[PDB]
Amino acid sequence: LGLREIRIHLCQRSPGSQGVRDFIEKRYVELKKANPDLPILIRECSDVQPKLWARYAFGQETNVPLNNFSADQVTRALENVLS
Amino acid sequence: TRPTVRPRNDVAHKQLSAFGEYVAEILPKYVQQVQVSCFNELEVCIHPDGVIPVLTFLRDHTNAQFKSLVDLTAVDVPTRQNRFEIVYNLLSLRFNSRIRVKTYTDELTPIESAVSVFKAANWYEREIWDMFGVFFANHPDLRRILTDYGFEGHPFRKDFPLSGYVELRYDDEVKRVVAEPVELAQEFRKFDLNSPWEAFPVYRQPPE
Amino acid sequence: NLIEVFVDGQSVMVEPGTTVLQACEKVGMQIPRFCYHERLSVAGNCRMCLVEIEKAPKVVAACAMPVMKGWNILTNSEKSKKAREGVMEFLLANHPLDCPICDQGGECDLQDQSMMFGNDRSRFLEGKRAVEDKNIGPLVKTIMTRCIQCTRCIRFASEIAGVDDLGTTGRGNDMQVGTYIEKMFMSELSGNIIDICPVGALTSKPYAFTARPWETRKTESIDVMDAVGSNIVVSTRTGEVMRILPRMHEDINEEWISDKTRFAYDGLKRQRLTEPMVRNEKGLLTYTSWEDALSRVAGMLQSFQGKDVAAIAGGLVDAEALVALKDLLNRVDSDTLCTEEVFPTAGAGTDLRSNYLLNTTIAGVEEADVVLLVGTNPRFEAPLFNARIRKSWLHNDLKVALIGSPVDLTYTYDHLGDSPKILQDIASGSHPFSQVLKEAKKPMVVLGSSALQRNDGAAILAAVSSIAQKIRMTSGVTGDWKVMNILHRIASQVAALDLGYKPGVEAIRKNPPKVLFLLGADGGCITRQDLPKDCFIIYQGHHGDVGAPIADVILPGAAYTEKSATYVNTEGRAQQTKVAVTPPGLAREDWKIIRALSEIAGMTLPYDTLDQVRNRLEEVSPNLVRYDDIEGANYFQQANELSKLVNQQLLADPLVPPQLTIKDFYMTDSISRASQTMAKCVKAVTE
Amino acid sequence: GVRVSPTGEKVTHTGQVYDDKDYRRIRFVGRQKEVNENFAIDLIAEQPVSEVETRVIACDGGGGALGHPKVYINLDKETKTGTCGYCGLQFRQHH
Amino acid sequence: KLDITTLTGVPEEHIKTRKVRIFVPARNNMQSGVNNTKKWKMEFDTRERWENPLMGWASTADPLSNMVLTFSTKEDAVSFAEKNGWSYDIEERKVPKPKSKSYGANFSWNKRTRVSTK
Amino acid sequence: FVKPIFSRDMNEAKRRVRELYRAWYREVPNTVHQFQLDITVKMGRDKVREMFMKNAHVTDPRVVDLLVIKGKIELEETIKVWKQRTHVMRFFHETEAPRPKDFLSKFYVGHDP
Ligand code: SF4
Ligand code: SF4
Ligand code: FES
């Protein structure tokens, strides 16, 4: 119930995406190391806001936009959605 | 250059031209282009807000009594926002002259009605109302010519199908003729006969 | 910079060098032509290009003479017209009187330009020559008589096709370009010559006599017969598909689509899932209304939510049906998401999306100063791309060499042995060939996607990742080059991986009853031994080949041109299909049946229109909503490589492409399989 | 002697007769389906093959401007007859 | 949004059911002529057309299906579909990229162009 | 911006429509008897209310007033005992089959969009 698939969206160039870009370039290897099971799909899409889908039980999905968030705040959301 | 070719009448082109600048003088406020082709066929612009005041002047002598509105020929080009291109063909009988003086309008512009001025346009009116939707200044009645009664469409808008959406037939238990959805058999099997490779370099709009 | 030369009146900043042709064609003026071709090569034969320069004593060849300053070019000038008249009087001096029976005769370029130029009356008084017919293939009939010594076809053939059987023969009168000897021309791009023929000399046999160009509508889209994702203009007529033509695009086909795709359409005309076919008490299927079969599968799929269900994705299948079906599996939390070809995922490569992408565009290949390939030959997966290779080989000049096999590519390539040694000797950089890899900048590293499987192909994966990283270590790379890339042959896995459903590993084929079939074209990866008990297995392909009979309670569905469902190119390019002739009978839009089953399942999908499922794609993909956007942030090999090295797999023998040779290339998907032209053609290449 | 369908009605010269399942066959009931007695196909090969010792020839279909456009049939290969693209009738160069 | 959805006589069904297609028409592959790539045009999406039970004719569904419309520019066509209330899909122009060419480029022993006999 | 047909802002227009409704709403029985419509007259008034509902999304006063221009023009043909009974019945489309907006039925019918 805690998760099945999780995924994020990211502007290729926008300032509100940049800290997140730096994050995926760093710690993503660690978080991905943490979870052999549940995928953390990531997309390059220049959708107006960086995004965070997270499926739970029976396909329901949380969706927090990542506009104007630092990578530390991003991670701050990330531990919150472990379940 | 002759047995097949139609000879070019320079003389009438000269006279029509000179008269064209003459008119260009006379009504600077609405008159624009003074087109003069080798067909001996002169043409002139009018702004739609300038429909009536020009036309009335035309009927009255200057050196051309533009008597008899022979036609209010109409064309619709969807590209231009001023899609409509109302044209006043005219003929000054005393001077045996012919001229084509056109305009433009949008869908909700109440272009001036020459009904008071010519009255010949009591129907050039209602056709070009009905086929299109070119609303007109002040006419005794805007009831439709040609197209039926309950009919909703505006064919000659160069829009919606040549068959139209409507195809009526008598029906049994209703004991009466009823309009129905088209269902054409065989369908107008349109041929695209357009030719790549321009035959007329002399024309040709630049790629720009 | 650019030299100045005058079009008739206007001054023009024309490029240094370059022909008068491109000069007039900059202002938009267009010179009459035949033998010349825009992406071929200049040839002086058939001088329709004649024009006089403003100071020219006599007319020049506009398609060939390089521009230079101080010239002026009155294309409309009388002498040039006398010249064109000189050409057309002669071409028609001996041409056959057979416009009407010509398949090209309804649209031949010779005709249009016969209208544009040349005297209306002719003055022949003797006896024209006429050559005998000269067969060069089952699928490319050649009437000849008609060919105008224009040599565009040999310059195509000898070059990009790589085959040289075609060519000139003889001199003086009764000279002919008829190829020597009886032997058929053959090529994997044999069909494209048909397009390139100005006249009716090279009329295709399968399409012969069938139709006339003006009648046809030209509905457009893209083919999925290749993973190349080539664009297409389709000449349908009267609800029937009359012929396929490529739609040009420099990033992809550059107006030279696969000969296999070109005759694919015929296969749509063979057997089709026309009506629903539910097995009876006898276990035999019978024709059935949708309410029956769909209420039945509605009776099955409410039973086994979550576990004990799976879904066999096809290779040609549209992404949308996958979207709705996985959403169905979401509502029941059925995690299973299996897909035809498996793709290895050390550190889970589905996430980075870039992993499976051919990160360099086919357009981007030309700038590479060095290119390498691994495993399957490009031509039996991307013949277009093979032509791109040979074109670069004829132009850009760079090394290429095969690994794992010496398959008969048209261009020169260094021979190399097999993976276990080569991959490590190159990963080490010890291999002299790898020393050449350090030697040259703008690297490219290709892998046959067939080798991604290879049981222990994960070894080749980590190996090649180490290789590309090592060549990055060699530096001289811009670093944004995205050296790491592969050639997918599948039309569907790339989008499913954009959605990252699963690696597609078939090891899952364990317990689940009531697996659903999407296409299910192969008898290989899946079969009914997965569940000894029930053989109940739902199906929604369109041709009945292989997968359909195994399945029960069959559910017929649309072919690709009919649906407007989208497809993703291997370069990550997104491009939707558009509607054409619509499904033949009870066949319908593919995912619509899914939304219907879900609607009966008590878990109806929130979106209604296909435009609204596309609206859903933005809230998940989110890249399917955007079409021409190949570009993105690109995750870079840093984070990528790190989990690749936290695994490692043993390398092995052997390493062979699936397709081997030409004769095996004619039967892949259900349309290519069922197409009759394919059967005749494979029997041709046999005996 | 048109080939007879299982229903018994004669097939069209372009063979296409309706299936026994086919309800549409009902239209012919009470009436007569019509198909031409004289198939052109048999009449194509019925004719003797004309032969001329020369080489290239010029068929006109019989009748100046009463037939197909003038056409130059080649006879490069004696292994085969030179069927017209129009008349459909064969030619050969006997020697 | 100057909708003329009611000002036009069109049935609401045909304006609801479908989006139209704005685009610039492609050059013939089979023919040299670039000439029709110029001038934009918009066309409605094709629908199913069942065969006539008699005589095997086409039996068209949607009446409007054969419509076609030229435009000077793309924003022009977008403006029409906006004025008229139908949904649409913009498509880009496709002028071929310029290619450097020269008569001698075919030759030269070193360039491996060479070609052959001529 | 551009010069208006007649009414400027909605109320100059809204005034015209009500003038229209009554112009129909009183006229209806006259029509019921001239053509001897078999419809109960309240059905006629209901249809009168309905055609005034289809035009609910109108927002430009030029669109409103142009619609009442055309609608009064239709009233012309109605009152003058032009048209025929059939033309009056064209508004009903009773010969036509009902349309199931439900998507599932739309699946069941045909290829459709
Ligand atoms: S090739 Fe062009 S010209 Fe020659 S016959 Fe066929 S159509 Fe007529
Ligand atoms: S095919 Fe016949 S006509 Fe077309 S180019 Fe080659 S030779 Fe000239
Ligand atoms: S155009 Fe190629 S030579 Fe005349």
UniProtKB/Swiss-Prot annotation, chain A:
GO cellular component term, pick one: mitochondrial inner membrane
GO BP annotations listed: aerobic respiration; blastocyst hatching; mitochondrial electron transport, NADH to ubiquinone; proton motive force-driven mitochondrial ATP synthesis
Modified residues (N6-succinyllysine): K51
Coiled coil: none
Membrane-spanning intervals of the chain: none
Species, as recorded: Homo sapiens
Protein task: Accessory subunit of the mitochondrial membrane respiratory chain NADH dehydrogenase (Complex I), that is believed not to be involved in catalysis. Complex I functions in the transfer of electrons from NADH to the respiratory chain. The immediate electron acceptor for the enzyme is believed to be ubiquinone.
Shown part of the complete sequence: 14 to 96 of 99
UniProt modified residues of type N6-acetyllysine: K51
Tree of life domain: Eukaryota
Disorder association: Mitochondrial complex I deficiency, nuclear type 13: A form of mitochondrial complex I deficiency, the most common biochemical signature of mitochondrial disorders, a group of highly heterogeneous conditions characterized by defective oxidative phosphorylation, which collectively affects 1 in 5-10000 live births. Clinical disorders have variable severity, ranging from lethal neonatal disease to adult-onset neurodegenerative disorders.
Name of the featured protein: NADH dehydrogenase [ubiquinone] 1 alpha subcomplex subunit 2
Subunit structure: Complex I is composed of 45 different subunits.
Glycosyltransferase keyword on record: no
Keyword terms of this UniProt record: Acetylation, Disulfide bond, Electron transport, Membrane, Mitochondrion, Mitochondrion inner membrane, Primary mitochondrial disease, Respiratory chain, Transport
Swiss-Prot record, chain C:
Subunit structure: Core subunit of respiratory chain NADH dehydrogenase (Complex I) which is composed of 45 different subunits. This is the largest subunit of complex I and it is a component of the iron-sulfur (IP) fragment of the enzyme. Complex I associates with ubiquinol-cytochrome reductase complex (Complex III) to form supercomplexes. Interacts with MDM2. Interacts with AKAP1.
Originating organism: Homo sapiens (Human)
Domain 2Fe-2S ferredoxin-type: 1-79
GO terms under biological process: aerobic respiration; cellular respiration; mitochondrial electron transport, NADH to ubiquinone; mitochondrial respiratory chain complex I assembly; proton motive force-driven mitochondrial ATP synthesis
Clinical note on disease: Mitochondrial complex I deficiency, nuclear type 5: A form of mitochondrial complex I deficiency, the most common biochemical signature of mitochondrial disorders, a group of highly heterogeneous conditions characterized by defective oxidative phosphorylation, which collectively affects 1 in 5-10000 live births. Clinical disorders have variable severity, ranging from lethal neonatal disease to adult-onset neurodegenerative disorders.
N6-acetyllysine: residues bearing it: K55, K438, K470, K680
Known catalytic reactions: a ubiquinone + NADH + 5 H(+)(in) = a ubiquinol + NAD(+) + 4 H(+)(out)
Reported cofactor(s): [2Fe-2S] cluster; [4Fe-4S] cluster
4Fe-4S His(Cys)3-ligated-type domain: residues covered: 79-118
Keyword Metal-binding recorded: yes
Signal among keywords: no
Cell compartments where the protein resides: Mitochondrion inner membrane
Organism lineage: Eukaryota, Metazoa, Chordata, Craniata, Vertebrata
Gene: NDUFS1
Swiss-Prot record, chain D:
Keywords, ordered alphabetically: Acetylation, Disease variant, Electron transport, Membrane, Mitochondrion, Mitochondrion inner membrane, Primary mitochondrial disease, Respiratory chain, Transit peptide, Transport
N6-acetyllysine modifications at: K70
Entry's Gene Ontology cellular component terms: mitochondrial inner membrane; mitochondrion; respiratory chain complex I
Nucleus keyword on record: no
Superkingdom of origin: Eukaryota
Signal peptide limits: none
Localization: Mitochondrion inner membrane
Bilayer topology term: Peripheral membrane protein
MF terms (GO), sorted A to Z: electron transfer activity; NADH dehydrogenase (ubiquinone) activity
Record-level GO BP terms: aerobic respiration; cellular senescence; circulatory system development; DNA damage response, signal transduction by p53 class mediator; fatty acid metabolic process; gene expression; kidney development; mesenchymal stem cell differentiation
Keyword Transport: yes
Family note: Belongs to the complex I NDUFS6 subunit family.
Known disease link: Mitochondrial complex I deficiency, nuclear type 9: A form of mitochondrial complex I deficiency, the most common biochemical signature of mitochondrial disorders, a group of highly heterogeneous conditions characterized by defective oxidative phosphorylation, which collectively affects 1 in 5-10000 live births. Clinical disorders have variable severity, ranging from lethal neonatal disease to adult-onset neurodegenerative disorders.
Subunit-level organization: Mammalian complex I is composed of 45 different subunits. This is a component of the iron-sulfur (IP) fragment of the enzyme.
From Swiss-Prot, chain F:
Gene: NDUFA6
GO biological process: aerobic respiration; mitochondrial electron transport, NADH to ubiquinone; mitochondrial respiratory chain complex I assembly; proton motive force-driven mitochondrial ATP synthesis
Family designation: Belongs to the complex I LYR family.
UniProt-recorded name of the protein: NADH dehydrogenase [ubiquinone] 1 alpha subcomplex subunit 6
Taxonomy of the source species: Eukaryota, Metazoa, Chordata, Craniata, Vertebrata
Pfam families: Complex1_LYR_2 (PF13233)
GO CC aspect terms: mitochondrial inner membrane; mitochondrial membrane; mitochondrion; respiratory chain complex I
Subunit annotation: Mammalian complex I is composed of 45 different subunits.
Clinical disorder: Mitochondrial complex I deficiency, nuclear type 33: A form of mitochondrial complex I deficiency, the most common biochemical signature of mitochondrial disorders, a group of highly heterogeneous conditions characterized by defective oxidative phosphorylation, which collectively affects 1 in 5-10000 live births. Clinical disorders have variable severity, ranging from lethal neonatal disease to adult-onset neurodegenerative disorders.
Species of provenance: Homo sapiens
Subcellular localization: Mitochondrion inner membrane
Topological category with respect to the lipid bilayer: Peripheral membrane protein
GO molecular function: NADH dehydrogenase (ubiquinone) activity
Keyword GTP-binding carried by entry: no
Keyword NAD: no
Predominant cellular place of this UniProt entry's protein: mitochondrion
Keywords linked to the UniProt accession: Disease variant, Electron transport, Membrane, Mitochondrion, Mitochondrion inner membrane, Phosphoprotein, Primary mitochondrial disease, Respiratory chain, Transport
